[model samples]
Target: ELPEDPKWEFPRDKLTLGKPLGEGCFGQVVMAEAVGIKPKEAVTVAVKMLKDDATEKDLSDLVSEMEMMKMIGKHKNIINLLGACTQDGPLYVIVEYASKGNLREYLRARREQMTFKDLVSCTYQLARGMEYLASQKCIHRDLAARNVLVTENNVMKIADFGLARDINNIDYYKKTTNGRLPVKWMAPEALFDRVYTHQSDVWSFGVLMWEIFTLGGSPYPGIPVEELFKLLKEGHRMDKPANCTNELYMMMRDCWHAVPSQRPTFKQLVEDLDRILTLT
Candidate 1:
C-alpha cells in the first residue's frame, strides 16, 4: 500500500522492503534496500513501518516524532535517521542498520567472551551517546541496555527515542502511565511520583552500568516487583556483580543516590568513565 497524496516528498519508489526483523507495539521493523537520495547510491537500511490498521492519530504522531528525531540529527554514538515515507499507506521510518542488533542480547550471548576493557569501551560509548543527548537538553527516561544498539565493529549507538523528552527549564516533568514501567532501572522519585529529570536518567544509567557488568543479568534477580519497589524505597541498592570492581561499583552507587540533585551529570560520567578506561 502507498500514499494517496503527492505532496509527500520522500522517494517511495526507491525503497524495497525486505524480511521483517522484529515487531513493536505500533509496527514492525524490516530490513530494506533504498536507492537514489542526494549522492544517489543504494544502501541497506532498517525500516520501521506502521501496521495496516494503524490509526490516523498513530500516523500523525509517528510523523511528529520523526520530525523531532530529524532535529537531533547525526552523532556518532546516536543512531541516525536516513529518511521517512509518510505519504505511503503505512508510514516508513528508515534508520541506520545496526548489524549486531540490540546490546542486551549481544552481551548475553558473548558474556563470558567479553573482556573488562571491552565492557568499559561499550559503556563509554553509551555514556558518550547519552552525554550528547543531555547536551541537547534531552532526557531519555528509558535508558537501558535493551534500548542500545550495536554495529559489527562494536560501535554502541543509542536508539529508541520514543520515551525521550525535552527539558524546558523545569526541574521535573510529571507523567502518568497505565502500562508497566521499567522499575529496575527507574529512580525512586520517578517510580513513586512519575517525576522525570536528567537526574532520574542518571539513576537508570547506573542500572545500565550494572547490566554491562553482569552481562545482561536481571536486576534484583530474586526480588518480585512489589518487593523490589519496597526495597528501593528502603534505599537498598543492588549488590555488586562478581565481575564488578569496587571502583566501578562505587561509581554506580553514586548514580543511585536517593536525592536526584546528588546524581552525577552525563558530562561527569564521561570524564569518570574515560579515567576508568585508562586504568582498566
Candidate 2:
C-alpha cells in the first residue's frame, strides 16, 4: 500500500518496540530491536515517534528531523540514522541505539572515575562529528552535552537535531524566537535575534565543554536564564571547573569570542584536541 524510498527505510513488521527511553514535547523515543538495515542480521535501535496527543505540527517536525538526518548521512561520531517507517498511520524514526544514555548522565554517574583519556576521547570525537556536520553545511543549533549520546562501547555520538537546520551555504538562518528556545545554551546573537550559524553552534559547543568538564553541572548555575543574554553580551564566562585544565578552558573560552568568525572552527578544534591528547 506504500512505496519505499529505500535509502533508509525500515521494515515496520520486523521491528519490535521496548520500553520508552524518553518523552518530550514532540514525542517519545523507545528502545527497539529490528531486523536488517545494516550488515548485521539483527540490531538494536532507538525509535522516535510522536506521542498519542501530538499534533500535525509535531509529526511534521519528527519527519523533518528524519529528513535532516538522512541529508547529513552517516558519521562515526554523529548518531546514525538507520531508517524510517513513514506509513501505516504512524511514523518511526529509527536510529542507532545508545544504551548508556546521554553523555551528561553518563559523566555524572561516573564522576571522578573517568580517566583523562576518556575525557579527551569524548571531546575529540564530538569535534570530529561537528566538523563533519560543518562540511555538510549543517548547523546543529542545539549542541549540548545532554544531546550527545554514549554508546555501549563508550563512544559519544552527537544526537538530537530538533533545532538543527541545513543552511545550504547561506550566511545565517533566522528563526522565530519561540518560547522554548534553549536560552541557557544559546549564543548572545542567537538569543537576542534568533539567528543561527555554525558560529552560534560553536558557542554552544563551548557550553557543552563546560558541561562535560563539570561532570554534567548546569550552565550558569546561579544566573537566571533571564539575565543570560545580557551577561553573555557583557563578556561573562563560566569559571573553570576544579577538575578542568587551563588549556582546555582556554579552548572553550575561544569558542565564546563575541565575533563569530573569531571562534575556533571545528577543524581547528580537532587539531587542538589532537595536540592535547598527544601531550597529556
Candidate 3:
C-alpha cells in the first residue's frame, strides 16, 4: 500500500458542489455540502477550484495559497482551510463557510439594524485577525472589509490570501507589477514606492474601518482613482462618517499617518477598539 496520505485531503465524492459563491480569473468559489469531512453527517462549506482553462501558473498559484494556509494554521478570527481534493484534476480547496457572506455586503444590507456596538465589534474582530497574522510573520497586503467574511452568528474572519506573503528577514515585500491593486485602501508609500509592510496593512485597515462606519460606501467617494495617490500625498483623508464617533474615527486616522512608523500596530488597534466598545 502507498504511504499514509496527508490528512488534509478530502474525498472527492464527499463534496457536492452547490451554487457559485465567488469567481475569479483562475477559478470559482462555490457553496458545497460535505459528508465524512471530519465524519460529518453533512456540513456546509466553501470550495475554491481552478477553472478547466486554468494555466500552469494558476495551478501553482492555487497550491501556494493552500500551502500558505496550512503554514499559518488556525486562529479564531482567520479563515482556516479545512481540506483539499487535489487528487482530482479540477481540485477543491474546502474552507469554512460564512453564511452571512462578507462584511461589506452584510453592512450594506443591515446597516440600519447595526448598532454602534456592532460596528466596533466587527473592527475589533478584524484587528485580532491582523494581530494573529502579524504574529505569524505574514502581511495581508489586500486587507479590506469586503475580504472579511461574516458568519451567521456575526463573527468576522479575515480572508483572501491571494496577495498575502511572508516578511521574514526582509521585513517587507516590494510590490511587483501585479495585476490589480486596491488603490483607495492603499497607503502612500505602497502606491508610490511599491513596498508593503505591516504598516501598509494598517493603512488598509483604516480604509476598511471607514467602509464599516459608512455602511459599505466606497472609499474616497468623489475622488478619481488616477488622482488618489496625489490626494493622499497632499495629506488628504476621508471625512468621518456621520454614524462614527470622534474617538473611533480618530483611531482610523492614526492608521493613515504619513510615516508608516507612526501607524498603530494591530495590537494597539485592538486595545483602542476595546475602549471604543465602552464608548458605544
Candidate 4:
C-alpha cells in the first residue's frame, strides 16, 4: 500500500516487494526494488517505515535515529543510508538492500552451515564496524546476530540504529536497561540492571561472536529470560563452547567479567579480531 500524502513519492511502480525481511517495534520490513532504472540497476532496499499513531517520543526517536544514522553510517560494515521518506508522510529510512539478509536468516537458509573461518570473518567485520562507532564515542546498545546483515559477497553490514546511542557520559547508564538485558548476551553488571559502559557492549559482542560461530544460534537455550537474570545476579557467566578456540572464547569470557571496566574497548576488539584474521 502507498501513502496518502502527495509529498510521499516511493517509486511504487518501480518497487516490487519480494519477501518480508523482519519485524521491529515500529513497523515491518519489506524488500523493495527501485524502479525506472536498468534491470541490472535494480537493487534490493530495506525499507523502514514508521507506524501510525506513534507516540511523540517514538516519532522523535525515529527522526533523531535517522539523523544519527546519517551522521555515522559511512563505514563499510555499517549499512548504507540511501534515502529517506519525509515529504511523503510517516517518514521512512531506505537502506542498501542486503541480499543474504540478516545473520539469523542467513543461518536458517543453509543446512551445511558456516565453518569457523566464516564465523571469524563475520565477527571481524562486525568488530570493524563497532571500532568506527567507538572512534566516534558512540555505542551500539543493541549488537546481536539479528542486527548484522550479509551481502552477496559475504560482506557484513551492521544495521538497525533505533538503539544506537552516544555513551560518552556514565550518567546515562543509571537510566538505561544495561542489566536485566538480553540474558544470553549481556555482562553480569549489565544483567543486574546497573549502569553500562563500553564494556557492556563488549559482553554483548562476545555473545554475538558465539552466535556467529554457532551459525547464529541463540546464546543459551532452555534458560528463560528471568532465570538468565538470576544467573547473572549470582555472578555466573555462560560457559564457553569447547569447539570455540581459546583466543576468541577467552575474549568473550573477559567481556563478561563482573567488573565492567575490565572489558576491552572497541579498539581492543578490533585488534583481537585483527590478530585472528592474520592467523587465518
Candidate 5:
C-alpha cells in the first residue's frame, strides 16, 4: 500500500512557471518563481509538473515520491522540497532551484576548469549525501550523475527521488520488467537478477564518480547493451578515466564487486573520499 501524501500545499496563483530545465520519463522540470508568502518572498524553485493527461500510475508515482521527499526533509546534500500544488489541476512538486543544473552538464561545460580539488569536492559531496540517504533507509534507485544537482557555488545535492524507495521491507526490489533501467550503472547482480538495494545505489555512485573524472563520458562505450550483462558477469569493468588517481579508481572498483555484501557502505565511502580530499 502507498503511504499517505503529505499535507503540504502551495497556492497555485503564487507560482509562475518558466521554460523547462529538462524532461524526465514522465514529466518536465521547469523553472518557477513563487511569491505571496510571509516576508513578501519571491523565490525561484524547480517545479516538477506532471502532464495534463497523466495516467493513474503516473499520479500514484508522483504522490509516492512526494511522501518520500517529505519523510527525508532538509539535508545539506539532499535536495530540499519547498512545497507542492496537489489540491487541483496537475500536481506540481516544488523543489529548491540548482542554478548550475545537473552534474553531467555542469561537468561537461566546466571540464577544462575543473581541478583535482573540484573533482574530489563534488565526489565527496555526492557520497556525503548518499550516506545520509542510506542512514534514512532510502534506496536512491536512480543515483546517477544526471540525477545529482549542482548549485551556483558547486555544491552537489542528490535529486530525482522518483525511483527511490524505502529499504525496510526486503533486500531487493524486482524490476517491473517493462520499463528500462540504467543497466550500465547497475551492479552485476542487480542487472542479472532484477534486484536492488542500498548497495546497488552504492554501485551506481561508483559510475557517477567515473562520470565526474571523465567529464561525463558515456559508460560502457563501444559495447552493445546486450553484451553488457555477459561482460559484467565475466568481471569486465570500466577502465579508469584519464588522470583519475589510482586511489579513486580503486575506490570505484570496490563498489563493482560481484557480491553485493562485499561492497562498501556509504559511510565508508564518505570517509574514504574525505581522506582523499584532505590530501589534495
Candidate 6:
C-alpha cells in the first residue's frame, strides 16, 4: 500500500512530496523536494511529519521540541531547521534535507562493517559535534544512532533535540524523572530519570559507539525492559568484544560506567577520538 500523505497539508507548489523515508514512534518521515526542477534535481530533503499518536502530554512534549530547535537556530553539525508550516491541523517541520538520511540507514547500507579506525573517525566526528554543544552547556540527552545523521559525503551530524536539555541549568535537576525509557544508552542513573550531567551524555555516547561497532544491533536486547531496569540497579553494564581494538572502545567503557559521575566528559571523548584520527 502507498503510504498516506499527512492529512495536514503543505503548499504543493513549493514542496513536492516524494517517497517515505523512515518513521519514528511519533511520526512518519518523508522526503520533500522543491518543485519546478527540470529533472527533479534530487534537491530533496527529509521532512518529519508528526503523526497523530500524541496525547496532551505528547503535544506538550512536541511543543518543547520545537522550542528547543528554534532556540538552537544554526549550527554546522546540528540538523538545520529550515522552517515549519501548520497549514493543516498537524504541524510540519522543515529541516535541511539530509541527502544520505539517518545513521541507522547508513549503517544498514554498509556491506563491510566499520573498522576500529573507521569507528573512531565516525565517532570522532560525532564527538566533535557533541563537544561543541557541550561547550555551549547543552546536553544532547538522547545521543543514539537514530538521532545522528550522515550526509552523502559521510559527515556525521547530531540531530533531534526533542530529548535534549540544558546541562548547566540548576533547574534541570527538577525535570529529570525515573522510568523514562525512550532510549537505553544512558547511564543507569540517567535511565532512572535522575538528573543528568554532561557525564551522563558521555555514557550514552559509549552505547552509541557500541551501536556503531555492531552496525546497529539492539542494546540490552534479549532481556525485557523490566529486567534491564533491574540490571542497571545491580551495576551491570555493556561489555565489549575481545577483538574490538577501536581506541573508542576503552573510552566507550568509560562513558558507559554505571555511576554517571564516572563517565568521561564530551571534551575528553572528543580529544581521544580526534587523536585516533591524527594517529591513523
Query: How much lDDT does candidate 6 score?
Result: 0.70
Compose the digit string of candidate 6's lDDT tens values, residues 101-159.
77876876773555657666887888888788877777777889988888776788898
Counted clashes in each candidate structure: 2, 0, 0, 8, 0, 3
The C-alpha stretches of model 1 lying farther than 4 A from their native spots are 1-9, 53-61, 169-172, 175-180
Which candidate model has the greater TM-score, 3 or 6?
Answer: 3
Candidate 4, residues 1-280, lDDT tens digits: the string is 3234332245445556667776676566778776533354777687776656576656766666666676685888988776666654457666787888788768757735557777777788888888888776676777888888888888898877776777655447567765324557666655556566677778888888877666657777667776776677677666666557888888888777777788888888888788988888
Q: Write the per-residue lDDT of candidate 2 for residues 75-154, one digit (tens) a residue.
A: 99988888889766588889899999998889999974788677877899999999999999998878888899998878
Q: Write model 1 residue lDDT over 109-172, tens digit each, in one string.
A: 9853779899988888888988888877777777888888898788998887665666756544
Candidate 3 to truth, TM: 0.92
Tell me the TM-score of model 1.
Answer: 0.90
Q: Of the pair 2 and 3, which is ahead by lDDT? A: 2
What TM value does model 4 have? 0.83
Clashing pairs in 1: 3-87, 3-88
Which parts of model 4 are misplaced by more than 4 Å? 1-19, 35-42, 51-58, 111-113, 168-173, 177-181, 191-194
In model 6, residue pairs whose N, Cα or C atoms come closer than 3 Å (at least 3 residues apart or on different chains), thus clashing, are 177-193, 178-192, 203-255
Each model's lDDT comes to 0.80, 0.84, 0.83, 0.72, 0.83, 0.70
76, model 6: CA deviation in Å? 2.9
Q: Pick the candidate with the highest TM-score.
A: 2
Encode model 3's per-residue lDDT on 245-276: one tens digit a residue: 88888988899999999999999998878887
Q: What is the Cα-based lDDT of residue 222 in candidate 3? A: 79
For residue 280, model 5's alpha carbon misses the true position, in angstroms, by 0.4
After superposing all C-alphas onto the true structure, candidate 5 shows an RMSD in angstroms of: 2.4
Worst 10 residues of 4 by lDDT: 1-10
